[PDB]
Amino acid sequence: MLEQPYLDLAKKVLDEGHFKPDRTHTGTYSIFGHQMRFDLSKGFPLLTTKKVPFGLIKSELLWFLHGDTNIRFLLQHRNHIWDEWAFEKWVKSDEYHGPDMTDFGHRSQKDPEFAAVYHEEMAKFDDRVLHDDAFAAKYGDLGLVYGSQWRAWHTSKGDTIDQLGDVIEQIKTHPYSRRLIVSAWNPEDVPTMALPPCHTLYQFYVNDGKLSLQLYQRSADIFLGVPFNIASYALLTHLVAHECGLEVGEFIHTFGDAHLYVNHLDQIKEQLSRTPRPAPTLQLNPDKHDIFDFDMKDIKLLNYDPYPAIKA
Amino acid sequence: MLEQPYLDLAKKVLDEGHFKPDRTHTGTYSIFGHQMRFDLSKGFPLLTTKKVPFGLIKSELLWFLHGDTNIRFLLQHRNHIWDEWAFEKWVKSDEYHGPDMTDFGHRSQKDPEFAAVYHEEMAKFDDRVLHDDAFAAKYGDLGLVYGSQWRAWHTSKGDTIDQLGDVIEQIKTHPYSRRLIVSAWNPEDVPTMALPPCHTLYQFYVNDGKLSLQLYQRSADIFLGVPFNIASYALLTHLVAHECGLEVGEFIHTFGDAHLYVNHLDQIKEQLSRTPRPAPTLQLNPDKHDIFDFDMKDIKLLNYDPYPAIKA
Numbered sequence A, B: 001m002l003e004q005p006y007l008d009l010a011k012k013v014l015d016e017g018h019f020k021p022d023r024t025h026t027g028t029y030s031i032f033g034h035q036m037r038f039d040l041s042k043g044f045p046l047l048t049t050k051k052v053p054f055g056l057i058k059s060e061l062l063w064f065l066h067g068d069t070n071i072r073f074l075l076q077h078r079n080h081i082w083d084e085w086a087f088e089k090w091v092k093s094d095e096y097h098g099p100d101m102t103d104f105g106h107r108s109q110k111d112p113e114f115a116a117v118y119h120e121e122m123a124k125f126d127d128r129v130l131h132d133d134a135f136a137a138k139y140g141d142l143g144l145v146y147g148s149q150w151r152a153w154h155t156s157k158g159d160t161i162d163q164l165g166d167v168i169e170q171i172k173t174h175p176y177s178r179r180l181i182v183s184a185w186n187p188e189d190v191p192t193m194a195l196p197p198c199h200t201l202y203q204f205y206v207n208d209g210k211l212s213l214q215l216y217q218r219s220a221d222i223f224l225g226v227p228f229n230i231a232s233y234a235l236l237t238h239l240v241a242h243e244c245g246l247e248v249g250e251f252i253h254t255f256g257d258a259h260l261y262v263n264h265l266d267q268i269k270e271q272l273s274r275t276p277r278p279a280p281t282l283q284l285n286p287d288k289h290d291i292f293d294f295d296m297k298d299i300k301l302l303n304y305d306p307y308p309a310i311k312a
């Protein structure tokens, strides 16, 4: 079925993965250079073998598509998936007068006492980002995240460049261009920045009135990250095609390193006993074609029939 | 055999390629997202089914590895493969007082009279680049080519960054890094530059004391370009491993578009009747480990047994 390459990736890393000691107190099993392919005409590749929250994917992608890098927009859509790096910055500042949150991630699972403390300081941060404009400006803005790299790339000469916007124009006038490329990898930023982008680069291609995209992803958390990643980029492919008036082709997901953490193994093993169901179908607003101006309600997911989420 | 993925790529584009009208007066057949893999422990993947000049690959790569962008170095190694873009610039200048060379490529095959004229103006250019320092400076320098992108990336702040040099240091101290990335794709340059780089990005990976590299190549001329490309990047993988004291792993060549020109079909078809022979073996200077300082004689290719070149 449509999602089978995900399951085959997971099982390959499980049976043939190379073990490597990890930055964060674990190990990983990984393979290098694996590719998955998804024929978008066959359905939307949101995994049926584990519930994946399509709401969060949708609002995060709209966020990128706005060139937005401020978490306030995500909070306004009840999306907390970028909160941590924003919190991670405010906590390391002068203004922060509360309890110490050094290595707050590590201590959250281990001590159920500190967890409820951080739950509350992160509640304080969020509400304040939502209502305090000056605060949103200082701490809500992540600076160098996908929205800036895709839509406002900073040039040596003080200027800024909308790569994806330029590429979409190129798809419409030069569909057979071999240069329909959006990169998120800036050699000037990457030595110091918070996270050198995992979704390093993507490329479009058109044949027979159908739009394909290839993503090159240097590093992938197969269990937690990849299911979101597959969905965002497939969504992005549909959105770009919709705007250019084309049909959908393939999404080709190419990896550098793709890995499982030594502590996530039972979860993925249990997921592999599950049997893919028919894929859902995506529907887009027939009246809107500028995706830089799309809203949540312009995107509908039909007939999604997933197995339970796995909390792991 | 080792080179089989090349032959399978060629045959796939031949039997399943999508036809597209081309910028230059032809068409192409292409596929999107294809990958080849080469296990470098099994031999050096210089094609045996068609002679590929390893001398030119070697000197071009040494050129990149010096951070050099001036053609004089290539000329001094009797390598003419970058001449044309250099010529293409000098011909479009004030100083050029000779016969008109507009669309000199097109007219070279068609008129055997104009061909010998250009053969001589290009002989004039070369010798002058070799001996005239001021001229070499103005016309011999291509500016934004792989040596600059790999070793002298220009930063917004007027500075310059040795990405590959930094990455090699990272391989030695952090071999399990998921960020061993060298990009050649600069969104600021790409709208205006001569050729937006075809070898867009590469990534290293280490397991079990072996070094692998993945190349993402946005666009590939299967017949003429890819055989050189496979060899340069495999060579580069051996050179980096040698410097870091590691063994060689895989070279994984991932494509965006990979294509055949509608006029190169008979050539590739004839090549497909040929049967791969055992691969050659590469030998490197056991006394040199700084590849930024390697010379032609530091690299030896053993037991290369190729079928004839194909002039096509």
Ligand SMILES: Cc1cccc2c1C(=O)N(c1ccc(C(=N)N)cc1)C2=O
Pocket: A060, A081, A082, A194, A195, A221, A224, A225, A226, A228
């Ligand atoms: C599943 C998911 C979904 C949306 C956004 C993100 C993720 C995710 O895993 N990261 C993320 C990125 C980087 C790092 C990291 N610095 N090691 C960790 C997590 C995200 O930003």
Ligand SMILES: Cc1cccc2c1C(=O)N(c1ccc(C(=N)N)cc1)C2=O
Pocket: B060, B081, B082, B194, B195, B221, B224, B225, B226, B228
């Ligand atoms: C086989 C080969 C070997 C070395 C260097 C080059 C090639 C090649 O094909 N090009 C090259 C690059 C760009 C273009 C182009 N502008 N459409 C044409 C040829 C090179 O620079």
Ligand SMILES: O=c1ccn([C@H]2C[C@H](O)[C@@H](COP(=O)(O)O)O2)c(=O)[nH]1
Pocket: A195, A196, A198, A199, A219, A220, A221, A222, A224, A225, A226, A229, B178, B179
């Ligand atoms: O979209 C994403 C973003 C991140 N990750 C995971 C992969 C890595 O485990 C981690 C990044 O760590 P480094 O590779 O940068 O070290 O985040 C994903 O799977 N998908």
Ligand SMILES: O=c1ccn([C@H]2C[C@H](O)[C@@H](COP(=O)(O)O)O2)c(=O)[nH]1
Pocket: A178, A179, B195, B196, B198, B199, B219, B220, B221, B222, B224, B225, B226, B229
């Ligand atoms: O190392 C290289 C460099 C170039 N090409 C070919 C592929 C394309 O036919 C052409 C570049 O043209 P565009 O894709 O930029 O349009 O050069 C290669 O095969 N290998």
